[PDB]
């Protein structure tokens, strides 16, 4: 019979790769908060206590 022949084989392309995934990390930066704590306290002064 006619014997089978081996396949030539896949032709591979050597190269260098970079794989990127979807970005989920939030964008971060430095901010500065300026504010003023305004505290108004109303105190009733009793005979012995406040």
């Amino acid at each position: 019979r006619r014997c089978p022949t081996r396949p030539e084989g896949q032709n591979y392309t050597e190269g260098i790769a970079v794989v990127f995934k979807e970005n989920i990390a939030p964008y971060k930066f430095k901010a500065t908060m300026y504010y003023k704590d305004v505290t108004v306290s109303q105190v009733w002064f009793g005979h012995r206590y406040s």
Binding site: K21, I24, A25, P26, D37
Partner: protein, 45 residues
């Protein structure tokens, strides 16, 4: 063949994907008195 550990996102990446973390916000907010105030001092005229 050796299979190295591979993952698209780590646990830290997934937890950091959130915009606000309740635990960290609370931890920073509840230090306000310890940082910008004198809790211990008592003033009596």
């Amino acid at each position: 063949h050796e299979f190295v550990p591979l993952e698209v996102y780590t646990r830290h990446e997934i937890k950091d994907s959130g915009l606000l973390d309740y635990t960290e916000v609370q931890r920073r907010n509840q230090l306000h008195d310890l940082r910008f105030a004198d809790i211990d001092t008592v003033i009596r005229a």
